[PDB]
Amino acid sequence: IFSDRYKGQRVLGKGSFGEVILCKDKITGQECAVKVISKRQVKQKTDKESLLREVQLLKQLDHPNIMKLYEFFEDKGYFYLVGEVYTGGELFDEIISRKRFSEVDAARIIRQVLSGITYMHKNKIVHRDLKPENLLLESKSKDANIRIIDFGLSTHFEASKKMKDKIGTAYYIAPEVLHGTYDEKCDVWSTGVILYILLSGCPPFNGANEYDILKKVEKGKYTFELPQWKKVSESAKDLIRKMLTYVPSMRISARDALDHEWIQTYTKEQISVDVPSLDNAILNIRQFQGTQKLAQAALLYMGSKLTSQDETKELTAIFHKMDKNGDGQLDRAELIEGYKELMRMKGQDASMSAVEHEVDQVLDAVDFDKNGYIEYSEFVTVAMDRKTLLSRERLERAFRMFDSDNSGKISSTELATIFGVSDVDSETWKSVLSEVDKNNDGEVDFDEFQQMLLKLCGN
Ligand SMILES: CC(C)n1nc(Cc2cccc3ccccc23)c2c(N)ncnc21
Numbered sequence: 001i002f003s004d005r006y007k008g009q010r011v012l013g014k015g016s017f018g019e020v021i022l023c024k025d026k027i028t029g030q031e032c033a034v035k036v037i038s039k040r041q042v043k044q045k046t047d048k049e050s051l052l053r054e055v056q057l058l059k060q061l062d063h064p065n066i067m068k069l070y071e072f073f074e075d076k077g078y079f080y081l082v083g084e085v086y087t088g089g090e091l092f093d094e095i096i097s098r099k100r101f102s103e104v105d106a107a108r109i110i111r112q113v114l115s116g117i118t119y120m121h122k123n124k125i126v127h128r129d130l131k132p133e134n135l136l137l138e139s140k141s142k143d144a145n146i147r148i149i150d151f152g153l154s155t156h157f158e159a160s161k162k163m164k165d166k167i168g169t170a171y172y173i174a175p176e177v178l179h180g181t182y183d184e185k186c187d188v189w190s191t192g193v194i195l196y197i198l199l200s201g202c203p204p205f206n207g208a209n210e211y212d213i214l215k216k217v218e219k220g221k222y223t224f225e226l227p228q229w230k231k232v233s234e235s236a237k238d239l240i241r242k243m244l245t246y247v248p249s250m251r252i253s254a255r256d257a258l259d260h261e262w263i264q265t266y267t268k269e270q271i272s273v274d275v276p277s278l279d280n281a282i283l284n285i286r287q288f289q290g291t292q293k294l295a296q297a298a299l300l301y302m303g304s305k306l307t308s309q310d311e312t313k314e315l316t317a318i319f320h321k322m323d324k325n326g327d328g329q330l331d332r333a334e335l336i337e338g339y340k341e342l343m344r345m346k347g348q349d350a351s352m353s354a355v356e357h358e359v360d361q362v363l364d365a366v367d368f369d370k371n372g373y374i375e376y377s378e379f380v381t382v383a384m385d386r387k388t389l390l391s392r393e394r395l396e397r398a399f400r401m402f403d404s405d406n407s408g409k410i411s412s413t414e415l416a417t418i419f420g421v422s423d424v425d426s427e428t429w430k431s432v433l434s435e436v437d438k439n440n441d442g443e444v445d446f447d448e449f450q451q452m453l454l455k456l457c458g459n
Contacts, residue, residue, distance in 0.1 A: 002073040002080045006034065008351045012085070014300075016129065016150050016165075017042050017157050021351045022085060032070060033085035036078050036351060043158040051156050054125075055081075058152060061123060065116030067136070067149045077347075088137025088144050095198075096286045098142060102275040103236055105142065106198040107266035111258065112146040113191055118254040120151050121184045128154040128182065130190035131172040132197075132289075163423040164299040168292050170213035171203040175220055176248055185248035188257060192243030196222070199232050201284020204244065208420035220246040228280040235262040290402040291414075295421040297391075297398035301450075302457040304391035309459075312384050315342045319376040329373035335359050338376075339383065358383065395453075399446050410449060412442040424456060432456055 006023040009031075013020055018037040024030065044051070058069045073080040088094070091109065095101065113135065120127070127134070129150060137144040159166065172193045174186035196204045204222035207213035216222075222244065224237055239262045242252035257263065266273060318338045319330060330338070339355040362382045366374055403410065410418070419429045432455040433440055436448055444452065 001075070002034075002082075005071075006032070006082065008034075008353070011350055011352065016134075016159075017153055019350055023082070031085055032082050034351075035081045035083075037081070037157065038348065039077055039079065041348070042160070044156060045158055046156050054152055054156065057123065058125070061119075061125075063116055063119040065112045065146055065148060066120060066151060067147045084147075086136045086138050086147050088139040088141070090133055091135040091137060091146060092132045092285065092289045094137055094140055094142065094144075096282075096289050098282065100277040101198075101279075101282050102277060103199065103233060104266050104271055104273065104275050106195065106236075106278075107263060109146065109198060110191065110195050111263050111267045113148065113194070114254050114258050114263070116146075116148045117187050117191065118258055121187070121254055124184075125152045126155065126182075126184045127151050127187050127190070128177060129159070129169070129173075130187050130194070131169065132194060133168070135194075164296070164303055166210075167296050167299060167421060167423075170207075170210050170217065171197075171205060173214075173217060174248075175218050175246065178214065178218055183248060185251045185253070188243050188251055188254055189248075191254070191257075192240055195236075195243065196240055197285065197288065199236060199240075199278060199281060200226055200228050201278075201281035201286075201288060202226060203288070208417060210423060212420075220244075228278065228284070231276060231278055231280075233262065235260075235265065238262070286404060290398075290404065291417055291421065294398040294402045295418050297395045298418065298453055299422055301391045301395045302453050304388050305454065305457050305459060308384050308388050311342060311346065312380060314345055315339070315380050315384070316377070318342055318345070319380070323376065328375055328377060330376045330379075331373055332359065332363065332370075335363075335374060335376065335379055358387070362386070395450065396446060399449065409443040409445050415444065429456065 005026060007026055008021045008023050010022045011019065012022050012033060015035060018035050018041075021034050021036065023032050023034045025032070052072075055069070055072045059071075062068065067086070068084040069081065070084070071080075071082040073082070098105075113130075117127070117130075127148070127150065130148070134149050136147045136149055138147060172190045174182060174189035176182045177186050193204060196202075203213075205213055205216040207216055224232075229237070239252075239257065239260045242260070243257060245251040252260075315338065318341050319335075322330060322334055322338055336356050336359050339359060343349045343355065359379075362379055363370065363374060365382050365386075366378050399410070402414075415429065415433075416426070419426070429452060432452050433444065433448075435455060436451045437444075440448070
């Protein structure tokens, strides 16, 4: 049983198929990351014979560019996958902060990805959902190793149709995955898409929304027409052509991609080639990452608002039931029990126990002196209306990051892109914008953008 060995320490974030918690071995103090997969929410593809067997194989494999899996647990409601924690964050979030970026830098990155992929394919493990989000760093530095996360998961679990879960996925998926017949070569395609983005800052198959992108992927046509491709070697372009070859049997293997002249030439420890900064690509990749992260932040903000509405209602009912006097005022002990009851009531909560500190932090705000009893109505507000901070601050941070010129505003064209990626219908967000500000002249500030998101989630 998972809880016998590990204690949750803090939430790392939401990943594919479930939340990721930083945990600690109760005996040895070893830190690890655990992915908790809800058996209710997430459908299984294969039998458990197959799932257990793949897990046992993964436990025996080791490669410096693949996330290390340590252990597997299960209960009636969840799977717990335990593995090594990496603290360097996502690759692209590191790249966007660089001032210089060359073909050499791109080559070093892609060689690591290809090395990990080659090793997993040798063991008949396919990723299928390879994308920048699945490339973590061991530290936030251009010199740190890349670790690929989520190999093998898509073989055993079905992806949700929820847009917050499938935002940003269309750019990287192989055409043959869309049509249903795929094998390990799909991972070479996704890596080719990533390389194309590193060298130009723009996806080869681009579009305003999921459908537009997938239509371009399926046709399979892409070009080096953009001006910034003049700064890129023909050798790099040749590798991209081989990796983005449409028919998978004609597409280069990960193993042979590692032997390609570009990889061999540009990953030399000693730089012997020209290294002009791909400056336009850096500007573009910042814009790309920025747009992707703001769209993700927006959907997570709307989700968290809905969740807070539900929890506000459930928490007030709980305290009302506890309030036998009917005076609306409870003490510290009662408030903690009620909050703990809420976290059980909504079964889909994080693995954490964070209530008592939360309670004391709320009480500090509501009644610093701790004279006695607390208006539980006041507590609920401060408990919920502050607990949304994580998503509210993340939304603002994503807005600021996106606004690279510090204009304080997002244009209608940018809104079209952001909402298109977010699966918000054109007429719908324009209608809401009109409701928020009649005299808007094709741009919103942060508050207006926030107001739009609230109207888009029934608030
Ligand atoms: C971005 C943040 C949500 N995150 N995500 C991971 C991946 C991860 C963590 C724990 C168990 C896993 C099991 C199977 C596949 C991936 C797993 C991860 C990590 N390893 N380290 C740090 N942060 C991580």
